[PDB]
Design a protein around this ligand. Structure first.
Ligand SMILES: COc1cc(Nc2ncnc(-c3cccnc3Nc3ccccc3)n2)cc(OC)c1OC
Length: 292
């Protein structure tokens, strides 16, 4: 522990405070902001900033610094919300700067497309402008799997993998968020975790399965109308699983069931999920041949 005390390479991460223009809050305290020359992708770009509340306790200060160090340790990957810089030197508050995902969380976004989805578009395709398709959904799944494969390879156990924690950027790029931290979460927890309290990469795979259900239900709430009590936990341990979501393919539902294997060691690995989802994305394209 005590990650906040790890060596910090200022030459690589320190960012000038006045090269940052704070904007409106995104949550709490995360703030949207404009950065000037933080990377070689453009002169100006929007970013997300986690700022240490003023009058914060020493403990809270250590927590935020620890988060920064953990982000640095983990490293970069296209499918995770990446660290861009930090303001740690005297003269102002501690700030951690990350990439900004313009479209918010995936669950909310998918729910907004309930009446704007078709498995495959048909010509004239303009009748389905901006609609989601099976390709989009499988692609989102594929991306998160790749992001988790990377996190798992860095020995990072997410613990709260859910659609609400997947953010959408431009060009349908999705990123996993809240992975370097210090309602009804039980609906995403593996049986061993509910009863034994220990999180592992394998319990993250179980959560990934629920996330897939969320994606192919277009943002629906897991276990529709079910009371999440002891009876639920008991039935889950016994083998009860959700039925297929409305927009799933047969292969995707089986993959959901595979991720929900009662035995942790029998669930697929994220690397296996990456290979499989990639294969399904490729096979789905083979179904859309009007323009071949
Ligand atoms: C549509 O507008 C929204 C945009 C975002 N984007 C975003 N982009 C980057 N990082 C975070 C982010 C959000 C919450 C917590 N952390 C982060 N990123 C972060 C991680 C580590 C260190 C600092 C920031 N969020 C999130 C929203 O809500 C989820 C949201 O709806 C209001």
């Amino acid at each position: 522990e005590h990650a906040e005390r790890l060596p910090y390479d200022a030459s690589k991460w320190e960012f000038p405070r006045d090269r940052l223009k704070l904007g409106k809050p995104l949550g709490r305290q995360v703030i949207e902001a404009d950065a000037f020359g933080i990377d070689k992708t453009a002169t100006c770009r929007t970013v997300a900033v986690k700022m240490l509340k003023e009058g914060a306790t020493h403990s809270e200060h250590r927590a935020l610094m620890s988060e920064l160090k953990i982000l640095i340790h983990i490293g970069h990957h296209l499918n995770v919300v990446n660290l861009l810089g930090a303001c740690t030197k005297p003269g102002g508050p501690l700030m951690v700067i990350t990439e900004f995902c313009k479209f918010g969380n995936l669950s909310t976004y998918l729910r907004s497309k309930r009446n704007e989805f078709v498995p495959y578009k048909v010509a004239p395709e303009d009748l389905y402008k901006d609609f989601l398709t099976l390709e989009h959904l499988i692609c989102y799944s594929f991306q998160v799997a790749k992001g988790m494969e990377f996190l798992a390879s860095r020995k990072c156990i997410h613990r709260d993998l859910a659609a609400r924690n997947i953010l959408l950027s431009e060009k349908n790029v999705v990123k996993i968020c809240d992975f370097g931290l210090a309602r009804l979460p039980l609906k995403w927890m593996a049986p061993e975790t509910i009863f034994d309290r220990v999180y592992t990469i394998q319990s993250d795979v179980w959560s990934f399965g629920v996330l897939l259900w969320e994606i192919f239900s277009l943002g629906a709430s897991p276990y529709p109308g079910v009371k999440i009590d002891e009876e639920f936990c008991r039935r889950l341990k016994e083998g009860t699983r959700m039925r297929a979501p409305d927009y799933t393919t047969p292969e995707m539902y089986q993959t959901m069931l595979d991720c929900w294997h009662g035995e942790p060691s029998q669930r697929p690995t994220f690397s296996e999920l990456v290979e499989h989802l990639g294969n399904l994305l490729q096979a789905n394209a083979q179904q859309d041949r009007h323009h071949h």
